[PDB]
Design a protein around this ligand. Structure first.
Ligand SMILES: *[C@@]1(O)C(=O)Nc2c(Cl)ccc(Cl)c21
Ligand SMILES: *[C@@]1(O)C(=O)Nc2c(Cl)ccc(Cl)c21
Ligand SMILES: *[C@@]1(O)C(=O)Nc2c(Cl)ccc(Cl)c21
Ligand SMILES: [Mg+2]
Lengths: 305, 301
């Protein structure tokens, strides 16, 4: 037993990380097949914030202006093209370590692992959730631009995130691997801010089920509630609405523990109203919302990659 | 910025994980060069859980009684030996993915990453710490024995933990990679209880220094303390004694922030007295004790 914030094994992604340099800007790239993906802002300069058209700035770069290093090996760039906010650098060598992979886009509340890198070199791996305000709570590290987020299915890596920028509140923002931003952000050199965030209710419920599976039962009570009654509580406490689909997804955990979801909602209601009264849940004095229902099941049932 | 416990990238260890079977027992092994390391209790039967005589069990075994599977490849076992509580199986192939590595025995308060594995296949990676009572608070299901803990400072993997068992309180016990248990535990299923656990004081202080570097000062106060008065108070909250070694180790973070180590001790004393009153430090409502002074510089706080 035990319950830890757990990332996917990062090996398959480590073999894909490269260093990309343009001028004085070095950041990370993702090498898959014969293409290196990185934030398109790698080419951006003080001088050219005065341009509405990235494609104008990019077409003036030569292939040789991009220095791409894969460990000790220089990778020769043979083409460059923009894909929304991601730059695609065609190179002359396919990555022999390319895993089975797909590009997927995730929803707020879903979780993934980030392999934090610095100048092409993997540094750390951590698990996180896409916040309702579409930011990621990331590391002390800087220089992590171009690091990616992913899930692993079987042997297939689903890449869902690339880190583009840090926001002044200490959270980060980025895109899917097709260059579409998560959230109301741009990658231009302008000051931006995270919107007010909310708590991921269905994930808190999942984690309360995890606690119960691990023997932490003190917060359970005899009562149940309604979706409507509870959602009035959620709104008061800056929690996301709970939907019927959330209820359905928690089905397996309700069946395994004998605690129906609206029974657990009554527990959560009382925790929000009355606090934890100096107690902890799975060693935390805060209600944890970065474990999905799927995460809890996977960790309490032993799935491997 | 934000604060996250990060684990080390696990790929270098993934390439070493194999499956070891003896009889009807399957657990994980670590394949380095031409040796596979695993817990010696893989040779135990249902009758050997309380008073196993490992030497007697092992003398009755042949190389071919150990099935070692690396991915879909069966490895050929060509010898075996026991070193303390680890079995070492010599195989006919050096692991081509062997990283640069060493075996290190760690002390309480040290952190490391764990690569949880089942049937030789890695499942997940997380960060943890050797508690003062020589247990670790991991996440381990049946079949995770032989999973390892490690650090990777500078390209070299330092293996520091191999998982052997779960104690009745839901915490975990294991050995170094020379097969010596951390703490007083033995690989027997007789009653053994973990010492009462305590908070790792030097790590809490390191994390309070990180909070300051990250911009948060709300918990500082105007006081200082002697080292002995600090320890007299903090023992009352089941905090580990703070030593002069710990004070010396906090020297760099002290110099960086301009907050003297014993001044930060005074601030911790008041936090234990007051609680947090609805406030968080680096996102937590409890004082974090699994981030070492060294961990703050590996993130370059
Ligand atoms: C980048 O900031 C820059 O210097 N110019 C530019 C344009 Cl034209 C479009 C997008 C971006 Cl991120 C940049
Ligand atoms: C990121 O490494 C990058 O390419 N640029 C940048 C800036 Cl300007 C600030 C912070 C980070 Cl993490 C990055
Ligand atoms: C460990 O994998 C092992 O060899 N046996 C065992 C049992 Cl019986 C319970 C839990 C674990 Cl992690 C293990
Ligand atoms: Mg109830």
């Amino acid at each position: 037993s035990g319950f830890r914030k757990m990332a996917f094994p990062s090996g398959k992604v480590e073999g894909c990380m490269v260093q990309v340099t343009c001028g004085t800007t070095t950041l990370n790239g993702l090498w898959l097949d014969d293409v290196v993906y990185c934030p398109r802002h790698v080419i951006c300069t003080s001088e050219d914030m005065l341009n509405p058209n990235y494609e104008d700035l990019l077409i003036r770069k030569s292939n040789h202006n991009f220095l791409v290093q894969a460990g000790n090996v220089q990778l020769r760039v043979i083409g460059h093209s923009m894909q929304n906010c991601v730059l695609k650098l065609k190179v002359d060598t396919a990555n022999p370590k390319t895993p089975k992979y797909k590009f997927v886009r995730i929803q707020p509340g879903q979780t993934f692992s980030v392999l934090a890198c610095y100048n092409g070199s993997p540094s750390g791996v951590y698990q996180c959730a896409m916040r309702p305000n579409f930011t990621i709570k990331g590391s002390f590290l800087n220089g992590s631009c171009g690091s990616v987020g992913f899930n692993i299915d079987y042997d297939c890596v689903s890449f869902c995130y690339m880190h583009h920028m840090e926001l002044p509140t200490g959270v980060h923002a980025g895109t899917d691997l097709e260059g579409n931003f998560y959230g109301p952000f741009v990658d231009r050199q302008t000051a931006q801010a995270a919107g007010t965030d909310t708590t991921i209710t269905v994930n808190v419920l999942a984690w309360l089920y995890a606690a119960v599976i691990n023997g932490d039962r003190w917060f359970l009570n005899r009562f149940t509630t309604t979706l409507n009654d509870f959602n009035l509580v959620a709104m008061k406490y800056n929690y996301e609405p709970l939907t019927q689909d959330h209820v359905d997804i928690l089905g397996p955990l309700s069946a395994q523990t004998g605690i129906a979801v609206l029974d657990m909602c009554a527990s959560l209601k009382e925790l929000l109203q009355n606090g934890m009264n100096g107690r902890t849940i799975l060693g935390s004095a805060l209600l944890e919302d970065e474990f999905t229902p799927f995460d809890v099941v996977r960790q309490c049932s032993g799935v491997t990659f």
